[PDB]
């Protein structure tokens, strides 16, 4: 997935240096997820590992949305510099991203409240996803624009 | 040893089952008796700490050991947490007929 993202980053954004930003960001957004999963009682088991595959999605989307929108603004105006462009785009998307992380976690926590053996199974997946959205979203807010 | 399941259910299972009843956070109890052996698995509400469940069951049982038949007391009662699962099975085998 990481390499496929690089291919989309390279073809769509027509830059090779733009690929470095996902490379640094995606692992950081997964290592962070692991650290929280350690602090919480969660262990690595088959169901959490399946969740990690799902988690890749949230993390990749967050990097892609940020880089692309900065590039879009950097191509909309010749006069705009990369750093001004980053600030502009971040102002546009900062509020949605915070709202995305709250909305998404609201989607996942009720799954954790499901009672029964199937809710225990489902919660292992859901909570991991909720951790991922938050860690990924903080990275999208701070680390990703800076790298861009 | 040497007792039929009916005898072991009435003589051994019933005294033990009664003592453990009322142990905190216990949803239900199930006991099966087979000639020579009694297996009784308490089931506890989800989220109960195993170590706390085991120790409680043990307490209640050591009070009712005396009621139990002497042969059963001589061998004693084993209380264990069954929450564990099988990581792996290792079978040592005599390829030859020498053991």
């Amino acid at each position: 997935a990481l390499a496929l993202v690089l291919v989309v980053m390279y073809l769509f954004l027509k830059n090779f240096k733009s690929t470095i930003i996902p490379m640094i960001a995606v692992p950081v957004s997964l290592l962070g997820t692991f650290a929280v999963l350690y602090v919480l009682g969660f262990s690595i088991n088959l169901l959490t590992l399946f969740a990690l595959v799902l988690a890749i999605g949230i993390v990749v989307d967050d990097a892609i949305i940020v880089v692309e929108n900065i590039d879009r603004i950097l191509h909309e105006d010749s006069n705009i510099s990369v750093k001004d462009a980053a600030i502009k785009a971040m102002n546009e998307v900062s509020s949605p991203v915070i709202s995305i992380v709250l909305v998404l976690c609201a989607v996942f926590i009720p799954v954790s409240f499901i009672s029964g053996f199937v809710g225990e199974i489902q919660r292992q997946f859901a909570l991991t996803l909720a951790i991922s959205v938050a860690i990924s979203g903080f990275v999208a807010l701070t680390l990703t624009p800076s790298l861009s | 040893t040497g007792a039929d399941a009916q005898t072991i259910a009435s003589t051994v299972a019933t005294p033990i089952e009664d003592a453990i009843n009322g142990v905190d956070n216990m949803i239900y109890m199930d006991s099966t008796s087979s000639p020579g052996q009694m297996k009784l698995t308490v089931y506890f509400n989800i989220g109960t700490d195993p170590d706390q469940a085991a120790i409680d069951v043990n307490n209640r049982i050591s009070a009712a050991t005396a009621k139990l038949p002497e042969a059963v007391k001589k061998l004693g009662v084993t209380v264990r947490k069954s929450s564990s699962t099988i990581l792996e099975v290792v079978s040592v085998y005599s390829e030859d007929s020498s053991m």
Partner: protein
């Protein structure tokens, strides 16, 4: 949306996909009472035939231990047939199971059931209820099972219940010892003493512990097996009188052939039988639980009572917690997007984007034939959220065009959608292709991989192919409605 609900109804609902774990468990039960020698011979015949098949490399056996009803029964025995690595064997576990079933399909000495190891340990793949019919009146176990077999016949008539079965078996051979207490006393013999003699000769008596290799080991006394095997075993046993007279056991004791339960089960401090059942493919698990309860109350006597274990217990004791939580979660999502858009109506557009993802997922699984497993449900959580994220962005950018740049309601919905076209395409392309290997995955965990994958691919495709055209339409309608309110 109507199609989604038709599709949800036609797709089977199954808890978790059956999976090849590499082992083909085999439960062999001989007729009740069979000696271990008979059972071992049968295990041997079963295992040399298995050796013939290429895929089954080795085989572990556990003679005298009944796997289903954990217990040591001489008639029962389980032979696990270890298969070859997934990458080394073309044949799946199911195919090999069929071959084993086919060879042993003929009537023979034993009955063999071949099954794949449980996908998730400690969990029944079925939605089956375990119900214990406790007897509060003191009736004997034989009487209990005649009462419960009647429950069984009523149960098999009812539609919701399927594969209704009971664990209790009174078939096992037993010998009943009749004690003439008139004679025993007259012979000046005390009852404990005449049983110590039986316990030593016919059975095993553990007198004391002896030291060996640094660990105390048991000292046991039993008779040569030549003497124990026959019913008249009693006649060679003798007990001293208090008058010092040898008196044979057969005088005052008689062994009578009888049949009785090998395994006696008591649940919740009451004698009980266990009724297991499966829901009807059409009917839900909860419906099956309700149905068997009704059958039990009418067929069984008032003296009986019904209790539940495992999954059934939880369903009966359910606080409807999940339902409350889900409603709260939605209300929270509503409000948190209301804050973002500063409009009460606008977050409805985001919630409408969600059923396009859900429709792609349930459509593809139906075409594939995959069921509504937990994996599918977890897939949905991701799908939903990814679809929501994309929608939140399209709607927000649209608001900006309408407000900041003063674009037209129609023009704004075109501009936003086009601005957000590229990010959605890029993320979908990367992710879908990334999880495409799951669809083709083989080896351990393959069924699970496939199940998570099929839902994901379908939903992702739907969200990028269909949702994006639709979300502007929703926004266009809501913005128009807001303007109408302003007028």
């Amino acid at each position: 949306i109507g199609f989604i609900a038709y599709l949800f109804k036609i797709v089977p609902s199954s808890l978790v996909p059956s999976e090849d774990q590499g082992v083909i468990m085999s439960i062999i039960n001989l007729p009740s009472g069979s000696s271990i020698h008979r059972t071992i011979e049968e295990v041997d015949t079963i295992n040399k035939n298995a050796t013939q098949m290429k895929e089954i490399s080795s085989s572990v056996s556990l003679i005298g231990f009944d796997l289903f009803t954990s217990s040591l029964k001489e008639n029962a025995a389980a032979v696990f047939f270890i298969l070859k690595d997934w990458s080394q064997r073309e044949a799946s576990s199911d195919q090999i199971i069929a071959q084993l079933f086919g060879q042993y399909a003929a009537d023979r000495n034993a009955l063999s059931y071949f099954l794949n190891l449980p996908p998730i340990p400690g969990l029944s793949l079925t939605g089956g209820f375990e119900m214990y019919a406790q007897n509060k009146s003191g009736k004997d176990y034989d009487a209990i099972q005649q009462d419960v077999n009647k429950m069984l016949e009523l149960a098999r008539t009812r539609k919701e219940l399927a594969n209704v079965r009971t664990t209790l078996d009174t078939s096992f051979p037993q010998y009943k010892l009749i004690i003439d207490r008139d004679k025993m006393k007259y012979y000046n013999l005390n009852m404990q003493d005449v049983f110590n003699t039986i316990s030593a000769t016919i059975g095993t008596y553990y007198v004391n512990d002896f030291p060996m290799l640094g660990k105390n080991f048991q000292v046991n006394i039993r008779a040569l097996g030549d003497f124990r095997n026959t019913q008249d075993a009693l006649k060679n046993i003798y007990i001293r009188s208090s008058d010092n007279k040898m008196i044979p056991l057969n005088s005052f004791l008689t062994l009578v052939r009888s049949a009785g339960p090998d395994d006696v089960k008591r649940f919740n401090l009451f004698p009980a039988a266990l009724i297991q059942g499966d829901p009807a493919p059409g009917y839900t698990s909860g419906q099956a639980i309700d149905a068997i309860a009704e059958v039990a109350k009418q067929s069984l006597g008032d003296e009986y009572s019904i209790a539940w274990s495992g999954s059934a217990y939880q369903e009966v004791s359910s606080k409807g917690a999940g339902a409350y939580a889900f409603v709260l979660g939605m209300i929270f999502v509503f409000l948190i997007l209301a804050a973002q858009y500063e409009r009460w109506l606008m977050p409805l557009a985001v919630i409408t984007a969600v059923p396009f993802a859900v429709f792609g997922s349930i459509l593809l699984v139906a075409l594939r034939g995959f069921d509504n497993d937990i994996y599918f449900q977890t897939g949905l959580l991701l799908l939903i959220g990814l679809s929501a994220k994309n929608a939140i962005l399209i709607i927000e950018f649209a608001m900006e065009e309408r407000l900041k740049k003063g674009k037209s309601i129609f023009e704004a919905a075109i501009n936003a959608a086009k601005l957000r076209f590229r990010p959605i395409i890029m993320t979908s392309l990367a992710f879908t292709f990334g999880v495409l290997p799951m669809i083709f995955a083989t080896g351990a965990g393959s069924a699970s991989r496939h199940s998570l994958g099929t839902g994901l691919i379908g939903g992702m495709i739907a969200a990028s192919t269909l949702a994006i055209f639709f979300v502007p339409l929703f926004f266009y309608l809501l913005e128009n409605f807001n303007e109408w309110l302003d007028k």
